[PDB]
Amino acid sequence: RHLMDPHIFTSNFNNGIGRHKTYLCYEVERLDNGTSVKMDQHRGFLHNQAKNLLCGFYGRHAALRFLDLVPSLQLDPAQIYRVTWFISWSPCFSWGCAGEVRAFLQENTHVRLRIFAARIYDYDPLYKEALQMLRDAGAQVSIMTYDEFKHCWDTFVDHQGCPFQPWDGLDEHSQALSGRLRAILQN
DNA sequence: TGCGCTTCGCGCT
Ligand SMILES: O=P(O)(O)O[C@H]1[C@H](OP(=O)(O)O)[C@@H](OP(=O)(O)O)[C@H](OP(=O)(O)O)[C@@H](OP(=O)(O)O)[C@H]1OP(=O)(O)O
Ligand SMILES: [Cl-]
Ligand SMILES: [Zn+2]
Numbered sequence: 035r036h037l038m039d040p041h042i043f044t045s046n047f048n049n050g051i052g053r054h055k056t057y058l059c060y061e062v063e064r065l066d067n068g069t070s071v072k073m074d075q076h077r078g079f080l081h082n083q084a085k086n087l088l089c090g091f092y093g094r095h096a097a098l099r100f101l102d103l104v105p106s107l108q109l110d111p112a113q114i115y116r117v118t119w120f121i122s123w124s125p126c127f128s129w130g131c132a133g134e135v136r137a138f139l140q141e142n143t144h145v146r147l148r149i150f151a152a153r154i155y156d157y158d159p160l161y162k163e164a165l166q167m168l169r170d171a172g173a174q175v176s177i178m179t180y181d182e183f184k185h186c187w188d189t190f191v192d193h194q195g196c197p198f199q200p201w202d203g204l205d206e207h208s209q210a211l212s213g214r215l216r217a218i219l220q221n
Numbered sequence: 222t223g224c225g226c227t228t229c230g231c232g233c234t
Contacts, residue, residue, distance in 0.1 A: 045227090056229040082229040095229050123229060131229090157228035 049207035124151035127164035
């Protein structure tokens with residue numbers, strides 16, 4: 035239903051250029067009889083609530099806003115669900131977001147979480163520990179490659195028929211942040 | 222609000 039502006043996607047999912055926002059596109063699919071049952075309306079996207087010191091507001095990271103709308107997704111406790119995020123920035127630890135997703139994964143064992151990050155948010159000094167905490171809690175933690183960039187444009191963007199157009203250095207930036215993530219999940 | 226540059230903003234307007 036709600037689709038992203040092409041420009042917003044291209045300026046925020048670029049894996050070589052950062053933004054002071056985080057977008058998170060999500061898919062919820064249900065596992066049926068050893069197969070995937072793709073939930074058609076359980077697809078969406080959100081961004082973080084921007085910090086607003088002028089209003090006294092500390093901000094709320096994209097990941098925590100996803101945990102906020104879980105109730106509204108009406109996941110059946112009986113069914114088993116795979117949640118996939120495509121997130122412009124890897125989840126933080128320092129602000130408690132990794133703690134929360136972990137706590138939520140321990141609580142909801144019928145949820146399997148997959149995270150694809152465009153870019154690694156090493157502006158948080160404990161970013162390693164975020165990614166490690168999330169892996170430890172069962173979550174698949176990956177870097178977004180061409181296939182996930184393309185999937186997200188095809189599924190979340192108001193493309194009006196335009197094929198995804200890879201930006202310069204997509205594959206190089208993706209290999210580089212793949213190397214960094216592999217080394218941080220080795221330990 | 223919109224700008225300019227851009228690591229879940231900041232510092233102008
Ligand atoms: O997820 P998207 O990038 O939007 O594109 C999908 C994807 O791509 P491929 O054709 O490149 O594999 C599908 O494969 P998966 O999502 O299962 O990985 C494919 O289904 P098939 O692999 O069976 O071809 C589907 O086509 P459709 O949705 O009609 O089944 C196709 O769309 P495009 O290939 O046209 O981008
Ligand atoms: Cl986060
Ligand atoms: Zn966070």
